[PDB]
Amino acid sequence: MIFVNDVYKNFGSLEVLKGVTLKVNKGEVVVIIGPSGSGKSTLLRCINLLEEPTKGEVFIDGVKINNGKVNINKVRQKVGMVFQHFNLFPHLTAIENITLAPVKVKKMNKKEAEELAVDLLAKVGLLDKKDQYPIKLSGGQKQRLAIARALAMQPEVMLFDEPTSALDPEMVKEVLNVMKQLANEGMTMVVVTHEMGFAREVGDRVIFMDDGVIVEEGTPEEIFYRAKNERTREFLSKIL
Amino acid sequence: MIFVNDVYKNFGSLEVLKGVTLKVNKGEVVVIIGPSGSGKSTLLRCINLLEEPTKGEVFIDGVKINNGKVNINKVRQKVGMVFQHFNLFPHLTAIENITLAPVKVKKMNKKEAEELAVDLLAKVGLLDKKDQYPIKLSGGQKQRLAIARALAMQPEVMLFDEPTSALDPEMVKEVLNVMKQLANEGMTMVVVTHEMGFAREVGDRVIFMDDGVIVEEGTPEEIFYRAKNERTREFLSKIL
Amino acid sequence: MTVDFLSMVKYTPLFISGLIMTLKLTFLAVTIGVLMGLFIALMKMSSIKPIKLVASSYIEVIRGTPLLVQLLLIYNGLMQFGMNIPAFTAGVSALAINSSAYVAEIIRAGIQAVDPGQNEAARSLGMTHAMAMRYVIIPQAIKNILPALGNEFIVMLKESAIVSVIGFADLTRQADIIQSVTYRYFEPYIIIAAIYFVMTLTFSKLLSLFERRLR
Amino acid sequence: MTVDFLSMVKYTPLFISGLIMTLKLTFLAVTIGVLMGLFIALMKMSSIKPIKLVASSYIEVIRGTPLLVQLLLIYNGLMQFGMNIPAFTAGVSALAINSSAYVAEIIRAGIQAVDPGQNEAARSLGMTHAMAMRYVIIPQAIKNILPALGNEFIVMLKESAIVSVIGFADLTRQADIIQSVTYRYFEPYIIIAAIYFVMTLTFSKLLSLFERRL
């Protein structure tokens, strides 16, 4: 399903990814962790080409998407993304946020799109906020809204780039809970996070990255209790 | 020693403190917690008059300091403050950061100031960074320097305004440790924090604030394990 | 002689006429320059290398060069080609050009000022640059732009006083006229400057007030 | 007739003299205008209300009013008081004044741009406003300000072409001069514009180069 194959990434003199390979199959919840400058979010964003690899290739559903001989919009229709800082459309209401892309990309019928949106709003517990504009939403309400919006395009995998880091601590749970609910429903997910609780609860696999490389991986309990590599132990000892 | 007495504060139509009283005596470590918008930081910043109460008064060492009949610089000499975003002086090196105020405020001899600084740098583990500029420091190193810098003015009470919130997770421990050490050496502390571990380990007293009011307070174990108030249990349930 | 403003009163219709003339110049000048600027912007966004180079050269050259020299280049410089463009069409042309460069840049910057995250969200939801542009980015750039366009006008008011030297009967030109019959330069200039000041204040007020209607 | 740039070559000394004349005007205008501007700023910070009112009114009036009208107000408007200040001092006075207002605003803004956290840290360490300003805030405001002063100069170069209308022998005036002997307006203006352009590019290059270092 997802196959990032030995990619490298540079931002000028900054080498962020130095040879990374990631395979995720349908239904997996994979969680990527590590210190700042590990390359977590860069690897995460290579999957739907928000970044372009300097070398290496990424295949989704068996087809390479970084050869310029494929329609990227068609790719990202399959691959959802939830952003650390929400990136809600400010001039658009909750419903409108959700329905913009289906109506304009998938050419869905407006009444149908509307029904989809109110279903998703109920799902993430935002029905009573349907019409409002973000500015009137709290951090949690915002991220739950962003998630609803992503889901309305019905992807087969969701990418999560530190979706909780910009939330007040009293607000982390609600967003994590929605994410877990999706995990329990078999959604394929790649999650970059600081919240180890999530990985404990619903993660299938944990990836520890350091200095632009995957240094160790395994199941959550393997990594959290029986980490083999010294760097992993260091990071965890500071983090847990 | 510190007596905030029934203060209120407004920022325009925004009522942030709605009648708050706080007494802290020598040697206490008081920790203030609560959801965003509780007014914690506003109360903390009333102590050294970084905010001015709309009503009410604040005394330190028994003298009223918000009557315009007092030298505020002499007060802030007694009451140190560590900031969420460090607020290091960028054009000054680490040691220069530390020695600026003793030299210019206390009119200390430069050799003496130099020795204070190297003592403190050693204390917080920044010896090898004495002549490095704030920009070459990681966040944890930054906050440890800010702490050394505060200490060189030898206050009788230290205020900590969320000293850990803008740190990458791998970096929280080292800063918290320094704080604990200060706690263990009998320093009077008022700490606003998200890190309940610290409150458990070294807090003497824990204050829970919500909607601009102190709604419940008590010892760490009382608040974390036997909380009487509903809001306290609710907040904790989202947080712990 | 000595200061005598009271003597200036009877010339009120001249000032009023000068004022109305400064207004008419500036409005039409901007109006063309904005549309021009919009167009210049579009060229700089084109994938086609020569066109981008041309719009860049236009903007770079006009911004990096004095308003006066452009004015005179239109007025004087064209005479030798059997061209006798009036003072008016010369001033408007010059201003619309200067303004076109500054307006084009206002647009580019108003766009780049919209958080790149918006584009990221939009693309990641399957939208193409075109769609992202129509339904997401531009409606926000606009709220960045209208305030800076509105400000450009206020600058164009002050700048337009330069058409006096070309012999256009603007608000500044009046001071020549009046003095020819009064031998006084000081008092009518103080009056004229006061009018530019009051105009500037007025328009700044409405502009910011409008800005709050947006941001 | 039709275009002939080659004929313009022999007039090179006129341009160079014009060029050198614009520089000398502009350099001096800024140098005075900076000193003046710094002074006006200090006034706007003073607690003595009249002084702040005067400086505010000054700045607001000059910025809200054309450079030309200030020039002519000095040159022509002063004649009737039996005053015949040269084209040069008229121009320099006008520019140094205009630039003085804008420099005052640049300074104020360069100060307001240093992070208020710097002041809070300084006060909380017991330093008085004076010391914070001296040892902490100002050394930073400066790095905020120099890029805007340097750029202001670049604006004043273009501006200075306006003293031609007063009869100053600057770079723009030359086109009148040359045409009196050649009947050509176009070509000497294009050359003049090209010269103003090269000056703007050069100074922008050097200015930004200075800027990245800070």
Alpha helices per DSSP H over chain A: 40-46, 72-78, 94-101, 110-123, 139-152, 169-184, 196-202, 220-226, 230-239
Chain B contact present for D113, CB below 8 A: no
Closest of A95, A153, A104, A91 to residue C130, by C-alpha = A104
Please, which experimental method was used?
Answer: X-ray
- For chain B, the distance separating the N- and C-terminal CA atoms, rounded to the nearest angstrom, is 32
| Nearest Cβ partner for C184 among D64, D80, D165 | D80
CA distance B190 to B167: 19
Set of chain B residues whose Cβ sits within 8 Å of the Cβ of A35: 168, 170
- Which subunits sit against C, judged by 3+ Cβ pairs under 8 A? A, D
CA distance C116 to C132: 11
CA distance B133 to D213: 16
Q: How far is CA D55 from the centre of its chain?
A: 19
Cα-Cα-Cα-Cα torsion B220, B225, B226, B227, nearest 10 degrees, comes to: 70
Closest of C153, B14, C124 to residue A88, by C-alpha = C124
Q: Are the Cβ atoms of B150 and D125 closer than 8 angstroms?
A: yes
User: In sequence order, what are the residues at sequence separation of 6 or more whose Cβ sits closer than 8 angstroms to the Cβ of residue B55?
Assistant: B6, B7, B8
Question: Structure tokens of A190?
Answer: 């790649």
Chain D contact present for C70, CB below 8 A: yes
Structural domain containing residue C58: 1-215
Is A9 one of the annotated binding-site residues?
A: no
Q: How many CB atoms lie within 10 A of CB A55?
A: 11
Is A52 one of the annotated binding-site residues?
A: no
Structural domain containing residue A44: 1-240
CA distance A20 to A32: 12
Burial (CB < 10 A; 0-12, 13-18, 19+), residue B183, is buried
Q: Are the Cβ atoms of A87 and C115 closer than 8 angstroms?
A: yes
CA distances from A133 to A18, A92, A94 (A): 41, 6, 6
Residue B100 sits in a domain of what CATH number?
3.40.50.300
- Which subunits sit against A, judged by 3+ Cβ pairs under 8 A? B, C
Closest Cα of chain A to C13: distance in Å? 48
Q: Do chains B and A touch (3 or more CB pairs under 8 A)?
A: yes
CA distance C97 to C33: 6
Q: How many domains does chain C have?
A: 1
Write out the H or E segment, with its range, that includes residue C105.
helix C87-112
Residue C213 sits in a domain of what CATH number?
1.10.3720.10
| Bridge partners of residue A216, in order along the sequence | A208
| Nearest Cβ partner for D118 among B50, B87, B150 | B87
Chain D contact present for B18, CB below 8 A: no
At residue A59, the 3 state secondary structure works out as: strand
Q: Are the Cβ atoms of D186 and C64 closer than 8 angstroms?
A: no
CA distance C40 to C98: 12
Is A140 one of the annotated binding-site residues?
A: no
| Nearest Cβ partner for C121 among A74, A87, A105 | A87
Q: How far is CA A50 from the centre of its chain?
A: 12
Chain C contact present for D203, CB below 8 A: no
Alpha helices per DSSP H over chain D: 12-45, 49-63, 67-79, 87-112, 116-124, 129-132, 138-160, 174-182, 186-213
Q: How many domains does chain A have?
A: 1
CA distances from D114 to B85, D46, D124, D141 (A): 14, 20, 17, 6
Which value, in Å, is the radius of gyration of the alpha carbons in chain B?
Answer: 18
CA distances from A232 to B179, C31, D199 (A): 26, 64, 58
Q: Are the Cβ atoms of B87 and D123 closer than 8 angstroms?
A: no
